[PDB]
């Protein structure tokens, strides 16, 4: 069928994007491109395609859209919904070849025929793209690029506008539009593929699938959202139990609405040599991010630096904990710095001034460096009897309810920066989570606030429960 | 739904394999694994899965199955059809934990429920795997791992056994079974996903899709094989216009049936220093394979070596052109050598003794080195008026039929090895294809036969036709 389709996935943001093309003519497009557009351009070249447009399903709350980046670097047409109210219009696209899409509009790239379906719910302007193969079967639909409207096993959350943008009563209103939009979904043929914009682990929904795609037919049978017949009842279900809204989501709606800065305009973070001499002025010059494993970070790190270890969770916590309005100095191994930078850029932390291998902490000065203690539950249990410790549980509200350490204080890591003043600087603070990931990060925050004595409980609540130690 | 599914794809072989798992319990399996199982084990580890089984949809003709590899390296159960006749039985699996599957059998990996469907057509034993999610919807099917039974916009060819294995009359036989098996397929709900073992570009079908999956409902509507209501007409249609059967498919059907050798048993090819002195012993010690771009190869290469440039087509031509009964010396840049070896291993070129960077060609001795000329169409056209050249066209038959250069000789590269003797050693041989890829490979093959004066036409037939030069029908 000379039709090309490919799915690109960002494991960190849980974000799916697509490159769709006609192999006969080569015309192609990208649906919800990441900011870093290189994988698309590179794949298109190899596959003999040319990206002529970039389609956004919605104004994204969790990552910077690569629509403009494609507009610029491949000369493509910026194709975005014009179905939102005046306050959710993308007027910047007018400085480019562009399309302001309405319900029923069609986009043609060779034999690729795409039809626009206005599907409000996640957002007011949200649209999904229905795909047909014009060569073989022009009136038979093949796939729906469902955006954050319908997921595998879930539908998009309607409450982001109320939480980050401050729009009163919009969660209810959008929840209702989600219910109406779902009726348009079930009117599609069962065979149609469902290709969403996010997957397992995204904050844009409550229980997404670790299976990359589904079908209109399957979702009608199994998706919780599609079993509801009372709208009132559905609103109820939809608003309950959604994850916390990361604070940086407000920034993304703005950036993606107004037009992100072009990666060429920021330029390359330079690789600096950092001898012990230069360290303090580097520490004083901005926020120091150290992406080493916590184990190593805990023994020796630059005082006041922040540890978000390089792994699947990086971009989540970068998002929760790093500011956009401050220059970042990065400690990162040469092999991975470029990836880390990309990840920062993917969620709009643009101002990374320079970076260097974290071996620079080795020969650094005594008044430039710091440490925290990795401790075992056995140690924590001894300090328990005479109440030597001020215990901090940084797990989620729900994990805390099932049981915590005795006399433990609860601040989840997502909220720690706000309530950090509540932690006593002169006390012996001992911090834990389920297994040791979040705590490690929390520990770096605590030190940077000024809490001198900080311990991290290796193995966490599970290691403690595991040892038969008592819980309240 | 705490269910994990991931598609791995070999662009070279156009082969799709899948990792399926239960995220509650961790239990996972792999469907039609490649021989290099490292990507599956790596992904499983990152995702908190443990691979417990390896499923084969059929005895594969185009690559080496990694079932055994997975059996050895993860302690997995080898799970294979027992529905074939006595001569297509994988009796080696009995030495491992294993399941000899029949139609209607089920494999349970945590909440992952898979049901075996016998679906002969591509092969007699072929089975597809139907997947249900036992956490959410135990009686609602979700996906069909169709193997080489139903592709996106096509179905498997039924003629490999007749072509590669000498099984008279079996194409027609299996063609008919394909038609029967297709009625089971269309009995499935429209919503069920179709996830095949191959994609666009495979020799295992006529016209497979560049879209990586479909649905029972979409294929019933648009797939050509599912429009035929008459069995006789379907056999006809199915058998016509199927691509060439690469000769190495015979070897794969054997290897996968009797059980392939373990990558650990072969070991790792040594990286070797090749100073100019060691070049002659290395040339006489086996088949030298040089994977540089043709351009570079053409200026200086080790006499008698073969050029298969490293790109998407490598494995296709390796399979057509290289023997598995001779040791292979490889010239490959350090950055890519391991990938090239992996590629070779995927199609059963196992005896790769050692390798070195192709800079070893630079300071080589004159009696160890050769070249061929890259020539323009303008040059070829001047040598035409006096018939100085012996033109060789290496394109497929259908391209030839569209038009070729005047007085040209037709031997497709796939067949060039057999009919090489029909090419004259003292003639000025000038070789071409559509664009110049295939012709470059041919040129090295020619020089290795002993054709002294060999030229390659840069840009091929298209550049020639482009300049308005004369053609013949
Ligand atoms: Zn979203
Ligand atoms: Zn096959």
PDB file of N, CA and C in Angstrom, chain A residues 214-250:
ATOM      1  N   UNK A 214      -4.339   0.296  20.469  1.00  0.00           N
ATOM      2  CA  UNK A 214      -5.562  -0.523  20.513  1.00  0.00           C
ATOM      3  C   UNK A 214      -6.438  -0.326  19.264  1.00  0.00           C
ATOM      4  N   UNK A 215      -7.747  -0.457  19.419  1.00  0.00           N
ATOM      5  CA  UNK A 215      -8.672  -0.354  18.303  1.00  0.00           C
ATOM      6  C   UNK A 215     -10.013   0.088  18.849  1.00  0.00           C
ATOM      7  N   UNK A 216     -10.761   0.825  18.036  1.00  0.00           N
ATOM      8  CA  UNK A 216     -12.059   1.354  18.436  1.00  0.00           C
ATOM      9  C   UNK A 216     -12.927   0.258  19.002  1.00  0.00           C
ATOM     10  N   UNK A 217     -12.898  -0.895  18.357  1.00  0.00           N
ATOM     11  CA  UNK A 217     -13.656  -2.047  18.827  1.00  0.00           C
ATOM     12  C   UNK A 217     -13.243  -2.541  20.196  1.00  0.00           C
ATOM     13  N   UNK A 218     -11.943  -2.636  20.450  1.00  0.00           N
ATOM     14  CA  UNK A 218     -11.459  -3.172  21.715  1.00  0.00           C
ATOM     15  C   UNK A 218     -11.758  -2.202  22.850  1.00  0.00           C
ATOM     16  N   UNK A 219     -11.529  -0.925  22.592  1.00  0.00           N
ATOM     17  CA  UNK A 219     -11.748   0.066  23.616  1.00  0.00           C
ATOM     18  C   UNK A 219     -13.220   0.152  23.980  1.00  0.00           C
ATOM     19  N   UNK A 220     -14.094   0.007  22.989  1.00  0.00           N
ATOM     20  CA  UNK A 220     -15.523  -0.010  23.271  1.00  0.00           C
ATOM     21  C   UNK A 220     -15.858  -1.141  24.236  1.00  0.00           C
ATOM     22  N   UNK A 221     -15.179  -2.271  24.115  1.00  0.00           N
ATOM     23  CA  UNK A 221     -15.477  -3.376  25.007  1.00  0.00           C
ATOM     24  C   UNK A 221     -14.819  -3.202  26.373  1.00  0.00           C
ATOM     25  N   UNK A 222     -13.577  -2.700  26.427  1.00  0.00           N
ATOM     26  CA  UNK A 222     -12.773  -2.779  27.667  1.00  0.00           C
ATOM     27  C   UNK A 222     -12.446  -1.479  28.395  1.00  0.00           C
ATOM     28  N   UNK A 223     -12.452  -0.346  27.693  1.00  0.00           N
ATOM     29  CA  UNK A 223     -12.048   0.943  28.260  1.00  0.00           C
ATOM     30  C   UNK A 223     -13.100   1.438  29.245  1.00  0.00           C
ATOM     31  N   UNK A 224     -12.690   1.769  30.471  1.00  0.00           N
ATOM     32  CA  UNK A 224     -13.653   2.106  31.532  1.00  0.00           C
ATOM     33  C   UNK A 224     -14.561   3.267  31.133  1.00  0.00           C
ATOM     34  N   UNK A 225     -13.988   4.223  30.404  1.00  0.00           N
ATOM     35  CA  UNK A 225     -14.677   5.465  30.054  1.00  0.00           C
ATOM     36  C   UNK A 225     -15.830   5.217  29.121  1.00  0.00           C
ATOM     37  N   UNK A 226     -15.736   4.168  28.313  1.00  0.00           N
ATOM     38  CA  UNK A 226     -16.749   3.881  27.296  1.00  0.00           C
ATOM     39  C   UNK A 226     -17.905   3.019  27.787  1.00  0.00           C
ATOM     40  N   UNK A 227     -17.907   2.651  29.067  1.00  0.00           N
ATOM     41  CA  UNK A 227     -18.994   1.844  29.640  1.00  0.00           C
ATOM     42  C   UNK A 227     -20.039   2.715  30.323  1.00  0.00           C
ATOM     43  N   UNK A 228     -19.732   3.999  30.484  1.00  0.00           N
ATOM     44  CA  UNK A 228     -20.624   4.947  31.137  1.00  0.00           C
ATOM     45  C   UNK A 228     -21.739   5.423  30.209  1.00  0.00           C
ATOM     46  N   UNK A 229     -22.957   5.450  30.729  1.00  0.00           N
ATOM     47  CA  UNK A 229     -24.083   5.992  29.993  1.00  0.00           C
ATOM     48  C   UNK A 229     -24.679   7.251  30.650  1.00  0.00           C
ATOM     49  N   UNK A 230     -24.404   7.479  31.941  1.00  0.00           N
ATOM     50  CA  UNK A 230     -24.834   8.711  32.606  1.00  0.00           C
ATOM     51  C   UNK A 230     -23.691   9.695  32.610  1.00  0.00           C
ATOM     52  N   UNK A 231     -23.931  10.870  32.044  1.00  0.00           N
ATOM     53  CA  UNK A 231     -22.926  11.919  31.961  1.00  0.00           C
ATOM     54  C   UNK A 231     -22.548  12.424  33.345  1.00  0.00           C
ATOM     55  N   UNK A 232     -23.544  12.689  34.172  1.00  0.00           N
ATOM     56  CA  UNK A 232     -23.306  13.098  35.548  1.00  0.00           C
ATOM     57  C   UNK A 232     -22.359  12.101  36.217  1.00  0.00           C
ATOM     58  N   UNK A 233     -22.676  10.810  36.134  1.00  0.00           N
ATOM     59  CA  UNK A 233     -21.842   9.774  36.743  1.00  0.00           C
ATOM     60  C   UNK A 233     -20.430   9.767  36.161  1.00  0.00           C
ATOM     61  N   UNK A 234     -20.314  10.009  34.858  1.00  0.00           N
ATOM     62  CA  UNK A 234     -19.019   9.973  34.189  1.00  0.00           C
ATOM     63  C   UNK A 234     -18.125  11.104  34.687  1.00  0.00           C
ATOM     64  N   UNK A 235     -18.647  12.322  34.700  1.00  0.00           N
ATOM     65  CA  UNK A 235     -17.909  13.446  35.255  1.00  0.00           C
ATOM     66  C   UNK A 235     -17.296  13.031  36.596  1.00  0.00           C
ATOM     67  N   UNK A 236     -18.125  12.468  37.465  1.00  0.00           N
ATOM     68  CA  UNK A 236     -17.701  11.975  38.779  1.00  0.00           C
ATOM     69  C   UNK A 236     -16.477  11.077  38.688  1.00  0.00           C
ATOM     70  N   UNK A 237     -16.572  10.059  37.842  1.00  0.00           N
ATOM     71  CA  UNK A 237     -15.521   9.058  37.719  1.00  0.00           C
ATOM     72  C   UNK A 237     -14.249   9.699  37.194  1.00  0.00           C
ATOM     73  N   UNK A 238     -14.407  10.549  36.189  1.00  0.00           N
ATOM     74  CA  UNK A 238     -13.287  11.130  35.476  1.00  0.00           C
ATOM     75  C   UNK A 238     -12.450  12.044  36.357  1.00  0.00           C
ATOM     76  N   UNK A 239     -13.092  12.827  37.222  1.00  0.00           N
ATOM     77  CA  UNK A 239     -12.372  13.796  38.066  1.00  0.00           C
ATOM     78  C   UNK A 239     -11.717  13.176  39.300  1.00  0.00           C
ATOM     79  N   UNK A 240     -12.274  12.080  39.795  1.00  0.00           N
ATOM     80  CA  UNK A 240     -11.676  11.352  40.906  1.00  0.00           C
ATOM     81  C   UNK A 240     -10.384  10.648  40.483  1.00  0.00           C
ATOM     82  N   UNK A 241      -9.409  10.650  41.392  1.00  0.00           N
ATOM     83  CA  UNK A 241      -8.211   9.807  41.284  1.00  0.00           C
ATOM     84  C   UNK A 241      -7.155  10.152  40.238  1.00  0.00           C
ATOM     85  N   UNK A 242      -7.255  11.328  39.608  1.00  0.00           N
ATOM     86  CA  UNK A 242      -6.247  11.747  38.613  1.00  0.00           C
ATOM     87  C   UNK A 242      -4.957  12.119  39.347  1.00  0.00           C
ATOM     88  N   UNK A 243      -3.783  11.870  38.729  1.00  0.00           N
ATOM     89  CA  UNK A 243      -2.509  12.237  39.382  1.00  0.00           C
ATOM     90  C   UNK A 243      -2.346  13.752  39.639  1.00  0.00           C
ATOM     91  N   UNK A 244      -1.344  14.129  40.439  1.00  0.00           N
ATOM     92  CA  UNK A 244      -1.037  15.553  40.696  1.00  0.00           C
ATOM     93  C   UNK A 244      -0.649  16.227  39.374  1.00  0.00           C
ATOM     94  N   UNK A 245      -0.901  17.534  39.276  1.00  0.00           N
ATOM     95  CA  UNK A 245      -0.506  18.313  38.099  1.00  0.00           C
ATOM     96  C   UNK A 245       0.868  18.920  38.338  1.00  0.00           C
ATOM     97  N   UNK A 246       1.884  18.455  37.593  1.00  0.00           N
ATOM     98  CA  UNK A 246       3.193  19.049  37.760  1.00  0.00           C
ATOM     99  C   UNK A 246       3.144  20.547  37.505  1.00  0.00           C
ATOM    100  N   UNK A 247       3.835  21.293  38.357  1.00  0.00           N
ATOM    101  CA  UNK A 247       3.779  22.751  38.337  1.00  0.00           C
ATOM    102  C   UNK A 247       4.272  23.339  37.008  1.00  0.00           C
ATOM    103  N   UNK A 248       5.181  22.640  36.336  1.00  0.00           N
ATOM    104  CA  UNK A 248       5.707  23.133  35.073  1.00  0.00           C
ATOM    105  C   UNK A 248       4.750  23.030  33.910  1.00  0.00           C
ATOM    106  N   UNK A 249       3.624  22.353  34.098  1.00  0.00           N
ATOM    107  CA  UNK A 249       2.631  22.250  33.035  1.00  0.00           C
ATOM    108  C   UNK A 249       2.124  23.623  32.602  1.00  0.00           C
ATOM    109  N   UNK A 250       1.999  24.557  33.540  1.00  0.00           N
ATOM    110  CA  UNK A 250       1.578  25.926  33.217  1.00  0.00           C
ATOM    111  C   UNK A 250       2.490  26.563  32.161  1.00  0.00           C
TER     112      UNK A 250
END
